[model samples]
Target chain A: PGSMENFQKVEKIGEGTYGVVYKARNKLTGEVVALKKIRLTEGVPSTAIREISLLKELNHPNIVKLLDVIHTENKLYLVFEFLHQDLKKFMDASALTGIPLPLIKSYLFQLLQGLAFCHSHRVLHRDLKPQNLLINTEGAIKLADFGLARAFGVPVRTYTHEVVTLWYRAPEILLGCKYYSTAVDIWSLGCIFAEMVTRRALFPGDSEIDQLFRIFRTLGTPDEVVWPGVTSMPDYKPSFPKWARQDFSKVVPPLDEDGRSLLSQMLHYDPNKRISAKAALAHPFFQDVTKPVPHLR
Target chain B: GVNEVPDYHEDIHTYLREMEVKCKPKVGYMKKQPDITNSMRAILVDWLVEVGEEYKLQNETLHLAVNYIDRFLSSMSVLRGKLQLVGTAAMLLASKFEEIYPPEVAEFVYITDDTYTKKQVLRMEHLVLKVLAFDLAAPTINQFLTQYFLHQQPANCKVESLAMFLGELSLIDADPYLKYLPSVIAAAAFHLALYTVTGQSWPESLVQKTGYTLETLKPCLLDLHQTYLRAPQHAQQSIREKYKNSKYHGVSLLNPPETLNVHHHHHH
Candidate 1:
C-alpha cells in the first residue's frame, strides 16, 4: 500500500543505534516526511519491530504518527510525518533569546496530554528526552523513538532493564529495579521540563552511579523518612555521601509558582509518589489556558 | 480470589480487552490454503512449542510466532513443503520481539537440520512482516492468562498452572478456538481452572471486571472443556509433556474434571 518512489530524500538528518534517518519530500503529496531507513540483514531488528508495533496502535496529535511503512528488498523505510526540529535542536537554536515562558508552558502541556494518553492506552514511553520530542514552527510537540517503549503486560524482567540515557532515567531504574512503570517516564519528563526552562541538562551524570549521585546532590540524599523502604532498593547503600536539599526555586528560577510545584511532583524520589501524567495535566501550571488547551497544531 | 485487574483501574483492563478484539488472526484462513489442513497447522504449532522449550524462548514468543504464521497464511498461500520454512521464520522474528537476547538466525537454520539457509530464513521474515503489515504486537493467550491469574484476589497456586495448560491446549487447535478472542479463551481457561481446582463458581467481581457476563462466556468455556477431552488430538502429547514439569506444577498430568458443567450460580 506504500510506495517509496513517491518520495525524494533531502539529506541525512541523523543516525541512531538502529539505523539512519533522512529528511525527505513527498513528490506526490508535497508533504515533508522523515525517511527512517533500517537495514535488515539478519531479520527485522527487534527494536524496529517494537517501534512499528507500538506506533501502529497510537493515533494522537501529540504522538508522532507512522505515515507509512515501506519495505524494500534489503532495507525497511519508516516514513513519518516530518517536523522541522526536535526539541533539543529547537532549544539549542534559541540560545540568544530564550524560549518564552508561555511557549514552554504550551509545549510541556502538550507533552503531558500525550503522555497521559499513552498511559491510558497501556503504552509506556520509557525513553523521554528532548531529542525524542519533535517540534515545528507550528508549535506542535509529538513523542518519537518508541523503540524502547513497551506495553505493560509483558513479563517484567524482559523489560525495565532496557537502555535509556543515564541522565533521564529514574532513580528506581538506576537503583536496579526490574519492575518499573510509567513513573520512570514521568521522572524523565521532569528532567526535560527543568532543562526547557534553564537550557541545560538537569542531571548530566556521566555514569549510572554518578547519575544517582547527581540526583541525590540536588534533591538531598533520600532516607527512610522521604522514601519508606529506600534501603531495600538494589542499589541503595549507606556509603553514599549524604547531601542536603537545594532550594527548588533557585535551581530553576524561570518557572513560576505553579510550574515549580508541577516539576517537583514529577521528580519524586519514590515512583509510588511520582505524579502521573493524568494528574500532572490537571495541575494549575496551565490554569491560564482555556478548557481544551486550543488546537496548537 | 481476585486477579490484578484493580478496582480503580478498570479502564486499563478495558484498553487491553479492546486491543485483543482489534488484533486477531483470520478465523477461516484455511479456506484459501489448499495445501494446508488444520492438522498441519496443529503440527507446526506443536513443534513450535518444542522450539520454545529447546531455545528457552518465552511462552509469549511462541504465541506471537503463531499469530504471525496464521496471519501470514491468511494473506498468502504456501506450498506444503514450504510450511516449515514459514514456521521457522516466524519463530526467528518472534524471539527477537520477545527475548532479551534472542538466538541467532544461524541457530534457527541449524535447528531445521539445515533444510533451509540463513538467507532463506531472512527472506521469509521479510515476507511474513509484509503480509502482516508489521503488526507484531498482537495479544497472546499467555499474556491474557497471566492477567487472569494475577487478577485473582487470593486464588489457588495451582490455578495459574492449570490455566496455562488450558491456554496452550487451545493454541494447538485453530478452529472454533480461532474464532474466539484470545481473552475469551483466557477467561474460559481461568473459569475452568477455578472450578477444577476449588469447585468454586466464577466470581461476580470477575464478571464485572472483564465485562463478559456468564451467558457470554459459556460457549467458549464449553469449547475449552471439549479441547481437554480429546486424545486423538493434535500436539496432545507434546503440550502435555511440556507442562509435565513441576515448574508448571504439572497440571497437565492431573486428571481433568468431566467436561465441566457451567453450573455457576445458574440464576446469576
Candidate 2:
C-alpha cells in the first residue's frame, strides 16, 4: 500500500482497544491491505512494540506480512497483506461440507510449520485461535494478530493470563502460572486441532474459572504425577474432582487414536511435557502427509 | 513445585539499568542526565518556562514538572526537537502528583490548544507511570534542602516560616538534585528556619542524604544563602521580564504581582 491517504476504506474489520482495523485498497498498487491505524500515544505499548519489532524482523510466506508501518502526526498505521477471509469465516461458509481431512491436515501442517519457526526463535504465539489464522482465496494459511505474542526465553516473567481465546487457553495459564513457555502455544494448537476435527470449539467456557472447570471435567483434575507442579501455581486451588479417569476417546469422539494421541501430547497438563511445535510437526498423525499441498485458488 | 527464588539475584536497579542499555535506544534514560551540557541545560530550563506559561501553572508546579522531565529523560533519549509531547506529559503527571487538585484532562488537552487529544495525554500518563515502573516516590530538590535548614535552627525557635523560605530558595538551585530526595530537604529547611528565628547554630555533621556529604554540599548551601540574599531584586526583575509577555496573561499563580509579593516577603 502507498500512503494511508491514498487508500479507500472498504469496510471495518474490527475495533480493538487502541485502534480500528479497516479493509482498504491502494489506488496505486491495486492491492487490498488491512489498515490498522493506531493512535500514537506518548509511547506504544511494549506488547505492541514487541509485536511490531518481531514482525519487522520476520518475513515468511506462512506469516502475514506487515507491509508498512506508516506514521502520521497523531497515529501509527500498520499495513498488512490482505487475506480474502479467515479460517473461521471459511468454516462458517463451509458449515455443511464438513471440511475434508486432507484440507484440514494441510492447513494444520502449515500452521505447525510456521509455529515451529516462531518457537525456534524462542517466540511464543500466546494467542492462537482459528480466528487469528487467516485463510486467503487460495487456501493458504497465515498466522495473524500477534498482539499477544512474546519473547519466551526470559527465565521467569509474569505473563498476563488475559491472553488467548477462552477455548484455546492452556492449562498452565488457566492455573495462573507466572512462568510459562512454548508449551502454552502447543496447548492452544491442540485446542485448534480438536476444533478442526469436531467442527466445533472444544472448551468454550464462560469465564477463566469456568474454562479450567471445563478442562478438568473433560480430562480429569491434574495431580502431582501428571503435572509436577499442579498444586503450587499462584492461582491453583481445588476444583470439583468430577472426572479423574475420564477417557480421552469420549471427550473427542470425532478424532481417531493417532489424532487423539497427538492432541493429548500437545495438551498435556504439564507445560514441560507438552508436545513442542517441532515435535508436533513430526508426529505420526501427520506422517502420511507432511508437506502442505499447493494452494488451489 | 517450581523452585522458588524470593529475591532477584542482582540489584533490581542494576538489572533495570542493564536492561535499558541492552535494549535498543542504546542511550538509556539515566544516560541523558550527566551528558546534558550547559547550553542544553539552559534550553531545558527555558522549555520548562515556556511550558509553564502555556499551561498557566504555578512556579512550584513548573519546578515539579521540570524535575519529572529530567527524571524521565534520564532513562530515555528525548531530543529537544521532540520535547513538546514529553513536556506536555511531564506537566500532566506533575499536575496530578504535585498539585493539591490538578487540572482536568480536558483542560490539559486545551492548554496545548489541541496539540494532543485527551486520550493521547491520558495514555502518556500511564506510559510515564510504566516507564518509571510505578516508582513515583523519588525525593525532590525542594524536599531535600528543607531538612538541612531545619537542623540549623535554634532549639526553641518556631522556624516554619523560614523553612518555607528556604524551600522556595531550593526551588531555584538544582544542587544535590534528586539524589538527596525529600526527607533530607525537610530536615535541612526546618533547621534553617529555626536558626533564622533564633541565633542557634546547627551542628556541621547533621547533613546526611543519599547524594552529598556535608563538606561537598557546604558550597551549594553557601550559594543558596547568596541567592536568598539577592532574591528580592533578581526575583522581581525576572518576574517582570516573564510577565511583560501577553502570552503569560492566563497564568493563575506566580504572575508578576504575586512574584513581587513573594520576593518582598523574603526581604522583610
Candidate 3:
C-alpha cells in the first residue's frame, strides 16, 4: 500500500543475497522499521520471494512481522518491525558466564511455541540458526529471516540439502539426504537449546564431514542397528570412525536430567523418532518453567 | 481409542481452511483483464501443465504456478503475447519454491520457443512476485483434496486420482470455480469423484468434518461435471492427456453421471 518514500533510512543493518537491510523510520509516523531493500539485477531472487511469501502468512507473535512490502520500479523493500539484536549476538556477549537457566528455559519455550505454530501450519525454517533468532526489548525470541522457509505440503518431494547452516543442521540433511521434514527444524532447536546453556556451539565444524563427526562423537557413530538405514545413507560410508556414545551428564554436566532427556529425543537420528515442537512444548523438562506464554492452547 | 491421534491433524486442517479463505484468487477476475480472455487463460494453464509434466515437477508445483498467474492477472493486465512471460516466470518461481532442483531459466525460455529470452523470464518473475506481493504460499486445491482424502481414508486410489484430476481441471476453467474457496472446490470434487467411482452420494454424516453437504456443492459439482464432459474436445485438454495416462489409472476414461443423483431437501 506504500513505497520506499514512506521511510527514511536510519542505518544499514545488514545485507543478504538479495540486497541491503536498513533500520529505517516511517517518515510520517516516526516509527522504526527494517527495510530489506533488494536491488534486483537479473530478477527478483527466489529467496526474497520465498521469505515474503511465507512471512505474510505467519502472523504469530514469535515470528517477525512484515508490516508492509514496498516495491518500486527496479527495487523491492520488505518493511518489518525493528528488533535490537539476534540471539547469536546476545549469547556471544555472555560467553563468560552463559545465560541464566530460567531465561534459557523461557526462551526455549517461546521458540517452541513459534516453531510449533509453524510446524502445525506445515512450514519449516530450513535454515534455522542463532543469527536468524531475533530478540526484542522484552527478551522475546522472534524467528526471523524466513528466506529459507517453505510450506511443505503432502506427497513430500525431495528437497535440496543445501538448506540450513552447518552448525545447526540436522544429521539427516548433513548426510546429503533430500527427505527431511519438521524434524530438521527440531534438531536445530536442540542445537540452539544446548548453545544457550553453555554460550558455545555444541557442534561447530569447519566442513560437512567435520559436522557429521562432531555429532557422531557426541552421540556416538551410528550403524544399521541404531538408525536402521544409516549405513545405506547417500553420504554415509563404511570407513566412518566408530565412537561410543557419551553419557549426557559428561557432555554437558550443567543441563538437568529432564533437559538432557528432552535434548536426547530432539536429536534422535531417525527423523521420524525426533521430538516434534508441539510435543516438546508439553515435555516434563518445562515442568518448573511455568510456560507463561499467551495463546498457547 | 488406545492409539493416539496425531496432535497436528485437527489444527492443520483448521489452519488450511482459514488460509483457503484468505488467499483465494479473486472470483471473476478474468473480466478485469482487458487483454486476456478466459480461453487465453486456459491455454496458458494447459501449457503450464505440459511444462510441469516435462520437468517432472510435483503436482503442487503446477497448481502453485497456475495460482500465481491467475492472481497476477487478476490485479494487473498483460498484453496477449506476453502472457507466456508471466507463465514462464510463475513456473520458475513455483519450481524454486517447491522443487528440490528447479529447472534453469534458459530451459523455461526454450520451452517458450525462444520467443522470450531468459532475461525476460527473470524480469517477469520479479514483476509477478511483486504484483502478487510474494504471498506465494497460497493454499492449493491439491492440498485441500489431499487432506479430505486422508480424512475419509478411501481404499480406492481411483477416487483420489479422479478428485485430483477434477481439481486441476478446475484451474483451467477459473471463473465460477474460482468463486469457490479451495475447500469448497475440493469438497465438491471429492463428492463428484466419489460418486463417479462409487455409487455414493455425499453422505449426511460427512457434513460435520468437511463443512459441506451436497446442497452447497451443487453448483460447483455441475460446472465441474460439464467440464469433465467436454474434456476430450476442449481446446486446452493437455490436462486430459495427463489423466489419461496409466499413471493416473486412466481416470479420465471413467464417466461422470449425466445428471446428479441427489434429491432436494433430503438427507441420506
TM-score of each: 0.92, 0.55, 0.87
Over B137-167, each residue of candidate 3 has an lDDT whose tens digit, in order, gives 8788887776676655456788989999999
State the displacement of the C-alpha of residue A170, model 1, in Å, after optimal TM-score superposition. Answer: 0.7
Q: What ranking emerges by DockQ with the best candidate at the front? A: 1, 3, 2
Report the poorest 10 consecutive residues by lDDT, candidate 2 chain A.
A151-160
Q: Total clashes, candidate 3?
A: 0
State, as a TM-score between 0 and 1, how close model 3 is to the true structure: 0.87
Q: Write the number of the candidate with greater TM-score, choosing between 2 and 3.
A: 3
Instruction: Name the best candidate (by DockQ).
Output: 1
* Model 1 lDDT tens row, A25-101: 99987999888888765678888888898798889999999998987867788988987778888778767767677
Candidate 3, pairs of clashing residues = none
* Model 3: CAPRI class: acceptable
2 or 3, greater by lDDT: 3
Cα miss at A258, model 1 (Å)?
Answer: 1.9
Alpha-carbon shift of residue A141 in model 3 (angstroms): 1.5
True contacts kept of each: 0.41, 0.00, 0.45
- Which residues of candidate 2, in runs, are more than 4 Å off? A17-19, A41-47, A290-297, B1-268
| Residue A275 lDDT in candidate 3 | 83
The DockQ-based CAPRI class assigned to model 2 is incorrect
